[PDB]
Design a binder for these strands. Structure first.
Ligand SMILES: Nc1nc2c(ncn2[C@@H]2O[C@H](COP(=O)(O)OP(=O)(O)O)[C@@H](O)[C@H]2O)c(=O)[nH]1
Ligand SMILES: [Mg+2]
Ligand SMILES: [Mg+2]
Ligand SMILES: [Mg+2]
Ligand SMILES: [Mg+2]
Ligand SMILES: [Mg+2]
Ligand SMILES: [Mg+2]
Ligand SMILES: [Mg+2]
Ligand SMILES: [Mg+2]
Lengths: 110, 101, 346, 208
RNA sequence: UUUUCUACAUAAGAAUAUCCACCACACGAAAGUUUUUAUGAAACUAAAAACCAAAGGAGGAUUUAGCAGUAAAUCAAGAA
């Protein structure tokens, strides 16, 4: 009966809504590959940035080393916005323009 | 009187195939399952094998309704081409026309 | 058009000529096939300076060799002339006397390998003796002066009956890799890791060119006899050239190019880096300079046609009115490879 | 033939239309052309008003096609024009200035000169008389002979090359050797003329 | 060889009947033999892998079909 298909469809609606708000054990087990986004936190580009700035600090004879100082600066931020807009928004001209500008600032070339 | 003895035996095959149908479905439920034991499956095998073979689905033959012709049957109208053509040409068959394109 | 040597800013859209021995020493490896036929036909070796090679060469004029290795990427449409904008850099930095390590197509190592050898020295890694020996035999004529110069510091075991021990010049290790083809690939990878260890010194300025970088991180066509596909990690060659782009080292610059033509499993019309390279490729490639290489504009186009009129390579009688120019421009959309293909039969 | 007899052929040439004012009988002719309400055919897709198309090249291209591939034939023709061109460059740059005045580097005029030279003048038709088939000398119209040359070229290079030998290379070879008359194509032409002479008496068998 | 493979859709890379002892391969197994799987109460059917790779090197007398989006070649769908 169609009444039954209607009640079970609105049932599926209520059910999915009630179990969309339940966080469970395995959701803290979430793989970073499972992501619909590219989160700048805990990234590979983040550790590439920190190693490149480690070697910039080691080559410049600047003995200044911190995660707070390197990441808190404007340029790793230009890279935040550039590579998050590169991975999430996808391939584009203005986006590789953001990339060229932020890495131009990071590697010191003008 | 059904038009033939053919249609007689095939009608009895429709009644029968309707009768043992549940038995068929439920036995072949286990028989076609992988997870269950092979041992329930040998016994289920002897079981559907025990059923009268006149009650099995594939022993049934589609024939034209009125003229009984075993072959050349149009599934939707259950009618042999001879009779189909006959009926459609007099225009006694709705919507059916001669194709030109 | 007028030129002298590789570096000039106002000489964009001009024809630079080189000698034949420049062509033999600088590119012992592959040169793009259509350009090789171009040279063999006109008997003159001529290229035309492009704005991307200008931008990139002015980024390789300003290099600070104390800084870690910087990665460049050349991207664009199929046959848009991005393999040769690598050649500009290659012969300008060969004329400045650097170490030029050049791999013409990476996919050749990824695709179509006749002989797949199994190696447990490297923990389940496969090698291609063919490619290793061809590449080494090209690397020998590539740079000769520096192969007598380098001193190898390691203890090295080729066989139970043979070993080379530290203090050896690298011409010897390379030719001992060429001679016995069996272990040629291990010799290639050893040449690579010791090149990277010795690049810390002021003797080594290392320009690394691997065309079709997407082959390193791409999906592999080659398979086991089990019919099971092998990953890009399973080859000794890829596993080694993966450490050659890592930017852990100083004194060098890594110039890269992403390819459609040579690719595998990639669609024809995607010219953008992130798609070709995929998640693994772009993620492991780290911040790099994304250089766009496009088709000729009106001045580069009328310069290319000037170049084809001077050599009388356009033999069509009607190619000498503005009609011919308008039609080849409308036909090629002024794409260099496309204009090559279109002036082939004309 | 979805067209009735009513539909006249397209004139695809740009130069006739661009310059009307100096010709009286032609102004009268294309006036009578479009004034009559003449239904005019859709111009073929293979033919273009492009300054680079030669209908000769067009028909040799077509005659080389197999199955439904215009692509594969256009490519083999590209590669043949290419092989002839670059090979003529290779003969030009190895030579002396006199022969740098002589040598032809145009694959187009080399093609037209390869077919104009390969064209047999007369050709034979069998006639039945008294139960025998005699081959009789027949004067031929231009187009049939054009076809003859082209077909012979294609047939030969399909036939007699070794399996490693590519098509465009072989066809470049025979094009160049036909330019100078020394290839097997003109040998077939000459056997045509020899057989045309041995029987010339029988030309009195010809009733047309 | 206007061929064969894989990518792929229409610029690529490799293979290519004889080197010779190949650890045989170039085309060409739709055929066989094994194992699966589809259906079915019942595999004799069908499909897919692996193996195997044979005749075949454009074919005698003599003949089929086609006048345009046709022939030819490539692809899918439906009827039962
Ligand atoms: N005149 C000129 N031609 C070029 C240049 N770069 C490439 N070409 C032509 O373009 C053809 C192919 O371009 P390629 O670099 O291989 O681009 P890809 O196919 O996308 O990798 C070559 O055969 C060259 O003749 C250049 O700087 N000047
Ligand atoms: Mg039945
Ligand atoms: Mg390329
Ligand atoms: Mg190819
Ligand atoms: Mg079989
Ligand atoms: Mg075989
Ligand atoms: Mg044989
Ligand atoms: Mg007949
Ligand atoms: Mg047909």
């Amino acid at each position: 009966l169609k009444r039954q298909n209607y009640d079970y469809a609105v049932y599926l609606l209520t059910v999915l809504y009630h179990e969309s708000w339940k966080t469970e054990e395995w959701e803290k087990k979430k793989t970073e590959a499972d992501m619909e986004e590219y989160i700048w936190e805990n990234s590979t580009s983040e550790k590439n940035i920190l190693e490149t700035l480690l070697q910039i600090k080691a080559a410049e004879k600047n003995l200044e080393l911190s995660k707070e100082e390197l990441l808190g600066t404007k340029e790793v931020e230009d890279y935040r916005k550039s590579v998050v807009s590169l991975k999430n928004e996808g391939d584009n001209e203005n986006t590789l323009s953001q990339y060229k500008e932020s890495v131009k600032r990071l590697l010191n070339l003008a | 009187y059904y038009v033939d003895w053919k249609m007689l035996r095939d009608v009895k095959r429709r009644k029968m195939a309707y009768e043992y149908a549940d038995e068929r479905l439920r036995i072949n439920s286990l028989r076609k399952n992988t997870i269950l034991p092979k041992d329930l499956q040998e016994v289920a095998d002897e079981e559907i094998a025990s059923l009268p073979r006149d009650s099995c689905p594939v022993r049934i033959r589609n024939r034209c309704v009125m003229t009984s012709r075993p072959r050349g049957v149009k599934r939707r109208w259950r009618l042999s081409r001879i009779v189909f053509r006959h009926l459609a040409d007099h225009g006694q068959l709705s919507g059916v026309q001669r194709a030109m394109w | 058009x007028x030129x002298x040597x590789x570096x000039x800013x106002x000489x964009x859209x001009x024809x630079x000529x080189x000698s034949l021995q420049e062509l033999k020493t600088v590119f012992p490896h592959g040169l793009p096939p259509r350009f090789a036929m171009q040279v063999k036909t006109f008997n003159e070796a001529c290229l035309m300076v492009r704005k991307p090679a200008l931008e990139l060469l002015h980024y390789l004029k300003n290099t600070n060799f104390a800084h870690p290795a910087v990665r460049y990427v050349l991207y664009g449409e199929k046959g848009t002339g991005k393999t040769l904008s690598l050649c500009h850099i290659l012969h300008f930095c060969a004329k400045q006397n650097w170490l030029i390590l050049h791999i013409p197509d990476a996919h050749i190592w990824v695709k179509n390998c006749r002989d797949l050898l199994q190696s447990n020295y490297n923990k389940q890694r496969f090698d291609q003796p063919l490619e290793a020996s061809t590449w080494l035999k090209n690397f020998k004529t590539a740079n000769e002066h520096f192969l007598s110069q380098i001193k190898v510091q390691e203890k090295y075991v080729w066989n139970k009956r043979e070993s080379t021990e530290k203090g050896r010049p690298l011409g010897e290790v390379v030719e001992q890799g060429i001679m016995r083809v069996r272990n040629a690939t291990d010799a290639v990878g050893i040449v690579l890791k010791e090149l990277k260890r010795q690049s810390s010194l002021g003797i080594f300025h290392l320009l690394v060119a691997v065309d079709g970088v997407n082959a390193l991180w791409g999906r592999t066509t080659l398979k086991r006899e089990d019919k099971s596909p092998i990953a890009p990690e399973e080859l000794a060659l890829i596993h080694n050239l993966r450490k050659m782009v890592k930017n852990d080292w100083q004194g060098g610059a890594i110039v890269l190019t992403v390819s459609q033509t040579g690719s595998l499993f990639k669609p024809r019309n995607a010219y953008l880096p992130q798609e070709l390279l995929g998640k693994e490729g772009f993620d492991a490639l780290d911040p790099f300079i994304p250089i766009l290489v496009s088709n000729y504009n009106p001045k580069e186009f009328e310069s290319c046609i000037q170049y084809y009129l001077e050599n009388n390579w356009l033999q069509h009688e009607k190619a000498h009115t503005e009609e011919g120019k308008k039609e080849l421009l409308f036909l090629s959309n002024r794409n260099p490879g496309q204009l090559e293909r279109l002036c082939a039969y004309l | 033939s979805r067209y009735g007899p009513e539909y006249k052929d397209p004139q695809i040439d740009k130069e006739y239309y661009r310059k009307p004012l100096a010709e009286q009988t032609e102004e009268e002719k294309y006036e009578r052309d479009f004034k009559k309400t003449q239904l005019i055919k859709a111009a073929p897709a293979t033919k273009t008003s492009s300054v680079f198309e030669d209908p000769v090249i067009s028909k040799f291209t077509n005659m080389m096609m197999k199955g439904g591939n215009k692509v594969l034939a256009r490519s083999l023709m590209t590669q043949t024009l290419e092989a002839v061109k670059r090979k003529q460059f290779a003969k030009y740059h190895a030579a002396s200035a006199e022969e740098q005045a002589t040598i032809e580097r145009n694959p187009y005029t080399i093609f037209h000169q390869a077919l104009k030279n390969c064209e047999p003048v007369i050709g034979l038709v069998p006639i039945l008389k008294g139960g025998h088939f005699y081959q009789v000398p027949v004067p031929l119209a231009d187009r049939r002979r054009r076809f003859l040359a082209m077909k012979w070229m294609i047939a030969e290079c399909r036939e007699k090359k070794h399996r490693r030998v590519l098509m465009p290379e072989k066809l470049s070879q025979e094009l160049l050797e036909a330019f100078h008359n020394q290839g097997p194509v003109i040998k077939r032409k000459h056997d045509m003329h020899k057989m045309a002479e041995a029987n010339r008496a029988l030309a009195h068998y010809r009733w047309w």
